[PDB]
């Protein structure tokens, strides 16, 4: 009752609260070096739109680094920057207004969920929530990933006491920095209290999959812990030791025999549903690139709804999905006007404007969002493309389409098409030194097996094919990847060895581009013919 009303109020005078919100942001911030440079000496919208440039991270990074290294927040924000968010790797400024906003959305999405999902209030979530450790900055302020700034905060520790915030995992397991340990412990605790599990998931679908893969590879050992009442010794985190011990409590040979039997069936089909029969849905994002995990999650889960709830970034949370048990391709996020002041740059002829406000976007037009927040970012380009699909009252509904500049992404890692071409060029110089000359390049992401990875097709005085000289390539291609990438390749254990598949098959593919539609090389049916044109495969290590 209150819900329908709250959401009605919130989607209705959108123009208003967005101006009021702009007002709240700018006014204190006439005090900042950054706004003083653009002559913003009072609150004025048009003046703001006139003088404040629309920027990218590179443009403002010189400001953000000064705060990173210890200058006053006031260079960019009059609200103290109390920390940073990690996406080299980039650092967005951050304060508790992010957590105010995040928890507002958590509360809003829980209301949406129970409104659509029968019987969720009568159990616990097995959530694979992970705390990653903070880098420190010279200013002395921590840098954390988005969810981690939430966990290492009282917004989590003192979170509401009710179904949506009740997990089968003690908080020590969620807050453990070693995710190898804590993923195991998630699975152990979830198994021990398996009847109470009415939902499961993670922030993104790749973690759901990795969790099911760890389960497949660790179930024997999980049951031995359940049999003995003892956690496996290798888990060192003291918090996991004590807390997951109280959960085990004692020997459970009976419950171990029970789960051993479910796992031992021929097929892993619907294994999730068989170990956790009261599960009603999987709460994990499967929009954007994450949609490629849908077939394999539907395999393991027996076509349980995959609910994608939220759209968000380090700049801001944008909004939520108000039709949660719809299909991934049909998902739209209804931006929430109390988060940040949103603007939008048209990306098709549908909107011939230079830039437009939230309440001004046109139906069926595509746009790159533009964020102004409560932590020092002003008119910052987000680098997503969204499509306007509809309107809840006066609040628009967006399809997430694409990330403006990417080639491949198999997890947390974002490998821009520039950091991708940092390999087509990079390792080539050493093919050059031995009697080889590169021909072409193009990348794909494989989800044939877990862990997926990056697919890459490359092109007298002998007989077989050279290995020593060209297996180095793949291993020095990787060295060109980002930090967020490598982390997942090894420590998250979410990606395998990178690889190349040797295939004049790109003067041939060039005709496979006029065949369906001046033409320059691409960043990411097509494959059946390209798949064929290969003679060998190699690994890096
Ligand atoms: N529900 C969702 N659906 C589809 N994409 C989502 C999403 N939630 C987040 N994302 C994607 O993840 C991005 C925000 O993540 P961040 O926390 O900023 C790490 P990043 O993507 O590496 O940032 P960067 O590419 O700007 O450096 C969004 O731009 C969006 O592209
Ligand atoms: O669940 C979250 O906290 C979240 C945060 C950022 C982006 C998407 C999300 O679901
Ligand atoms: Mg960005």
From Swiss-Prot:
Coiled-coil region: 1-25
Binding site for AMP: 287, 310, 314, 333, 384, 403
Pfam family, one: GH3_C
One biological process term in Gene Ontology: cellular response to hypoxia
Membrane-spanning parts: none
Activity control note: Specifically and reversibly inhibited by salicylic acid (SA).
EC number(s) on file: 6.3.2.-
Binding site for salicylate: 106-109
Keywords noted in UniProt: Coiled coil, Hypersensitive response, Ligase, Plant defense
Influence of pH: Optimum pH is 8-8.5.
Tissue: Expressed in seedlings, mostly in cotyledons, leaves, hypocotyls and sporadically in roots. Not detected in unchallenged adult plants, except in flowers.
Disruption phenotype: Enhanced susceptibility to virulent and avirulent bacterial pathogens P.syringae pv. tomato and pv. maculicola ES4326 with or without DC3000(avrPphB, avrRpt2, avrB, avrRpm1, or avrRps4) as well as to the oomycete pathogen Hyaloperonospora parasitica (downy mildew) isolates Emoy2, Hind4, Hiks1, Wela3, Cand5, and Wand1. Impaired hyper-sensitive response (HR) and systemic acquired resistance (SAR). Compromised salicylic acid glucosides (SAG) accumulation. Resistance is partially rescued by SA treatment.
Induction section of the entry: By P.syringae pv. maculicola and pv. tomato. Induced by PAD4 locally at the infection site and in a salicylic acid-dependent manner systemically.
Family in the record: Belongs to the IAA-amido conjugating enzyme family.
Name recorded for this polypeptide: 4-substituted benzoates-glutamate ligase GH3.12
Organism: Arabidopsis thaliana
């Amino acid at each position: 009752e209150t819900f329908e009303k709250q959401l009605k109020d919130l989607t209705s005078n959108v123009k208003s609260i967005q101006d009021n919100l702009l007002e709240e942001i700018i006014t204190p911030n006439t005090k900042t070096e950054y706004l003083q440079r653009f002559l913003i000496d009072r609150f004025d919208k048009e003046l703001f739109k006139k003088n404040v440039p629309i920027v990218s991270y590179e443009d403002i990074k010189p400001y953000l680094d000064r705060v990173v290294n210890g200058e006053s927040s006031d260079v960019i924000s009059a609200r103290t920057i109390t920390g940073f968010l990690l996406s080299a790797q980039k650092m967005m400024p951050w304060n508790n207004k992010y957590l105010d906003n995040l928890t507002f959305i958590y509360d809003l999405r829980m209301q949406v969920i129970t409104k659509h999902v029968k019987g969720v209030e009568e159990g616990k979530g097995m959530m694979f929530l992970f705390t990653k450790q903070e880098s420190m900055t010279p200013s002395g302020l921590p840098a954390r990933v988005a969810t981690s700034s939430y966990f290492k905060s009282d917004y989590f520790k003192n979170r509401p006491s009710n179904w949506y915030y009740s997990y089968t995992s003690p908080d020590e397991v969620i807050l453990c920095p070693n995710n190898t340990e804590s993923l195991y412990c998630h699975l152990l605790c979830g198994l021990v209290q398996r009847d109470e599990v009415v939902r499961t998931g993670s922030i993104f679908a790749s973690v759901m999959v990795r969790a099911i893969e760890v389960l497949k590879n660790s179930w024997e050992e999980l049951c031995s812990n359940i049999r003995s009442g003892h956690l496996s010794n290798w888990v060192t985190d003291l918090g996991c030791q004590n807390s997951v011990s109280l959960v085990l409590g004692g020997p459970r040979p009976e419950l171990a025999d029970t789960i051993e039997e479910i796992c031992n069936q021929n097929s892993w089909k619907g294994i999730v549903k068989r170990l956790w029969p009261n599960t009603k849905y999987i709460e994990t994002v499967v929009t954007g690139s994450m949609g490629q995990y849908v077939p394999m999650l539907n395999y393991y889960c027996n076509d349980l709804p995959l609910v994608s709830t939220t759209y968000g970034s380090s700049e801001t949370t944008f909004g939520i999905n108000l039709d949660p048990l719809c299909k991934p391709e049909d998902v739209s996020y209804t931006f929430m006007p109390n988060m940040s002041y949103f603007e939008f740059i048209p990306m098709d002829g549908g909107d011939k404007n230079d830039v437009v406000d939230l309440e001004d976007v046109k139906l069926g037009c595509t746009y790159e969002p533009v964020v102004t927040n409560f932590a020092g970012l002003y008119r910052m380009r987000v680098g997503d493309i969204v499509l306007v699909t509809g309107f809840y009252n006066n609040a628009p509904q967006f399809k997430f389409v694409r990330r403006e500049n990417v080639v491949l992404s198999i997890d947390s890692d974002k490998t821009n098409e520039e950091d991708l071409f940092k390999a087509v060029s990079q390792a080539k110089l050493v093919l050059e030194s031995s009697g080889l000359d590169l021909k072409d390049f193009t990348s794909y992401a494989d989800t044939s097996t877990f862990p997926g990875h990056y697919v890459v097709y490359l092109e007298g005085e002998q007989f077989e094919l050279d290995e020593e000289a060209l297996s180095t390539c793949c291993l020095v291609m990787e060295e060109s990847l980002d930090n967020v990438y490598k982390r997942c390749r090894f420590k998250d254990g979410s990606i395998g060895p990178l690889e190349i598949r040797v295939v004049g098959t790109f003067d041939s593919l060039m005709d496979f581009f006029i065949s369906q539609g001046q033409y320059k090389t691409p960043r990411c049916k097509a494959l059946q013919v390209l798949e064929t044109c290969v003679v060998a495969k190699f690994f890096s290590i």
